């Protein structure tokens, strides 16, 4: 294998050389021409109370009105964000939930965690009660993320270093994505749904093709675990949050890092990241209990969302870009605008 | 100002709130325990006396105990250990047959105990330390001296002294003795000890809350 390891080093050098060759200009130099965004002063429009433990995940419905939140009190709550009404309260069989998802159709929600199982719930039952439609088992590590593709397809990343595509109808994992050397902590699904990107504790992010089960590209540059990952609205780029306290913007077509969002007073890790509808903003959650808004093109800290008494564990921007929701370990979700 | 169906939806939301708070009250009065210990530490037999996380629910002298065996999680503890920051106490299992049984497992057990005890998430959380397999240890000590694992041990190779040496060696790994306690025990006596330790933890937390401690 020694000669094969030398060949591997040669290939690493070749890809580095190619990326350097295409690295003609930096994003900051290109963006120097455009004006900064004014101080982004958002304020809390709603506060969603009812969770009695640390909120670990939240997700918006495609209607930009309903959102599901998962907390380790063993509950998924579906909120009417306009009125703050609770639509549903789903009791989980395992209270150690670490991720939740909302079907684009709105018919189902999913969740998972330390149980290593992704459970799908049917919201639109004739009986008038939400019940588990299936339990996707097969992961040997905790479920870190899950995202619906259709009513029948869901992709889940796990702490066993692998992601898997599932056929909810049969319960079998259609595809298994392998290659990460550490726990896969986050997973972002492309706008076209044909690609998804995952970030793992090996401080790398990989681009996968859903249908071919193929790892197309690998992105590195973080010094620590990648806790969060999000696709740029165009789908041609994505941003990663890390424990090393920096967000980084990567481009699929350029195949390298574009820009890094860091500041000296920010020494803690990043729990969640999210873009705005236009992509000009990059909202990120931090362990220091507040969320920082970043000018995605200038890397300037455009604003701050400081309203939480504990770690901001999750973010979310509605599909229409009208509001931002931030869950936190203080057990409150807040809608900002 | 609200519609009829808007008012009905609000009523539904208030019902959900009532159920949520009832469940919260039900959960608040339950004891949560985290069970740890590397390898064949005897936890597989500890769980019997009371595919990922294994939750075990039991009641003893009118306390509801939830015990979380997370030993099957072959993943980075760094990423999910904070989920348990809030458990009443941690149960740590150590096998005293691991003096010379190599992966010398007792050094790995000491490293794991050091990591768990001095974790930033468990500053207040106390530790119940179970020292299992005292029986086999009582014979192995005769045939194999304890110096094999701790060359600096100056005591006699007798059970009564070696056991105390192991206990103090594990308890000295506590770098925050001013805020955290360790309840060591050599393994209904076992569940009785768990009950005693958690009762003490609860009482001391309450006394701190009310200003008496």
């Amino acid at each position, epitope marked *: 294998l020694d000669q094969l390891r030398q060949e591997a080093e040669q290939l690493k050098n070749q890809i580095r050389d190619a990326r350097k060759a295409c690295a003609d200009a930096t994003l900051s130099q290109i963006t120097n021409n455009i004006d900064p965004v004014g101080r982004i002063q958002m304020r809390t429009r709603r506060t969603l109370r009812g969770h009695l433990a640390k909120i670990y995940a939240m997700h918006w419905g495609t209607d930009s009105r309903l959102l599901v939140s998962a907390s380790q009190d063993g509950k998924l709550i579906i909120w009417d964000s306009y*009125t703050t009404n609770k639509v549903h309260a789903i009791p989980l069989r395992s209270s150690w939930v670490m991720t939740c998802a909302y079907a684009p159709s709105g018919n189902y929600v999913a969740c998972g965690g330390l149980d290593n199982i992704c459970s799908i719930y049917n919201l639109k039952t004739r009986e008038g009660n939400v019940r588990v439609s299936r339990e996707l088992a097969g992961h040997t590590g905790y479920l870190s993320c899950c995202r619906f593709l259709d009513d029948n397809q869901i992709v889940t990343s796990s702490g066993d270093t692998t992601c898997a595509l599932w056929d909810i109808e049969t319960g079998q994992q259609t595809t298994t994505f392998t290659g990460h050397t550490g726990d896969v902590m986050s997973l972002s699904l492309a706008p076209d749904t044909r690609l998804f990107v995952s970030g793992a504790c090996d401080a790398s992010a990989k681009l996968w093709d859903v249908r071919e089960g193929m790892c197309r590209q690998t992105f590195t540059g973080h010094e620590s675990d990648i806790n969060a990952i999000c696709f740029f609205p165009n789908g041609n780029a994505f941003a990663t949050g890390s424990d090393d306290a920096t967000c980084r913007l990567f481009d699929l077509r350029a195949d390298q890092e574009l820009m890094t969002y860091s500041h000296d007073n920010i020494i803690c890790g990043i729990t969640s990241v999210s873009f705005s509808k236009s992509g000009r903003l990059l909202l990120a959650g931090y362990d220091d209990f507040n969320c920082n808004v970043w000018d995605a093109l200038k890397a300037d800290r455009a604003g701050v969302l400081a309203g939480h008494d504990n770690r901001v564990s999750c973010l979310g921007v509605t599909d229409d870009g009208m509001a931002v929701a931030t869950g936190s370990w203080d057990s409150f979700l807040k809608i900002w605008n | 100002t609200l*519609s*009829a169906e808007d008012k009905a939806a609000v009523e*539904r939301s208030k019902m959900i709130d009532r159920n949520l708070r009832e469940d919260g009250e039900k959960a608040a009065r339950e004891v949560k325990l985290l069970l740890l210990g590397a390898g064949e530490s005897g936890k597989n037999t500890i769980v019997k006396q009371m595919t990922g996380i294994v939750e075990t629910h039991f009641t003893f002298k009118d306390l509801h105990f939830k015990m979380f065996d997370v030993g099957a999680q072959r993943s980075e503890r760094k990423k999910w250990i904070h989920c348990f920051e809030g458990v009443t106490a941690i149960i740590f299992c150590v096998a005293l047959s691991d003096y010379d049984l190599v992966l010398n497992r007792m050094h790995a057990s000491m490293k794991l105990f050091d990591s768990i005890c001095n974790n930033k998430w468990f500053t207040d959380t106390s530790i119940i330390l179970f020292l299992n397999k005292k029986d086999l240890f009582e014979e192995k000590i005769k045939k194999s001296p304890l110096t094999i694992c701790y060359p600096e041990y100056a005591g006699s190779n007798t059970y009564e002294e070696a056991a105390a040496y192991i206990q103090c060696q594990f308890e000295d790994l506590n770098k925050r003795k001013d805020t955290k306690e360790i309840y060591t025990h050599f393994t209904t006596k076992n569940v009785q000890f768990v009950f005693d330790a958690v009762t003490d933890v609860i009482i001391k937390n309450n006394l701190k809350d009310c200003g008496l401690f």
Partner: single-chain antibody
Amino acid sequence: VQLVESGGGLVQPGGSRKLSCSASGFAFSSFGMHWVRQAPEKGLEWVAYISSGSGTIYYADTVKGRFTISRDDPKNTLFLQMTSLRSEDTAMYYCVRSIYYYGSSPFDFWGQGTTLTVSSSDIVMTQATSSVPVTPGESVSISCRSSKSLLHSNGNTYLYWFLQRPGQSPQLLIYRMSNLASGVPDRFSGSGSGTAFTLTISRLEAEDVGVYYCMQHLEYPLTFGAGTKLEL
């Protein structure tokens, strides 16, 4: 899902009687329940409502004080205590389930109902066209109007459409004037505006024959239309 009402019969005027309905195949405890009557040769009329959790109860002015509605959630049974029975109370009584949350479908299931015979302001809903000859395969339209505008501040138009085929209980077609109920063919379409609504059937099938009723859900003294008959 099944609702089976029981207790129908013949009562002398001035008497008292108790109707019952046993729920099965759904989470009865989480639904609101309605009683809806129908005189032997007239349209529907809302009687009473009991909310999920029994926190709210409503009655029609014609029965308020004479009737009382109650539910036994552990038994999954809905009741209607009735006293001072008058000749006007002679009607087929239906039990209707309705769950209220964002995006739900109130009035989505109707029981078969019990016949009760007795020995010898509100928003007005208008369905002027009482009957309409029809042939299969042709486009048809049902029209409706209301005194108040059913469009609420929050953007919802609280109009509901029901079809009662001969020898059957009413079936929900449209809720909130545009949403097609589950199990309803896409042929039916709900249109309308403030205070004027219409229901249209494209490529009408033979099974789309019966009385089409309109109902408002804006002010809780719920009112039905006179109904429109479709005949082949």
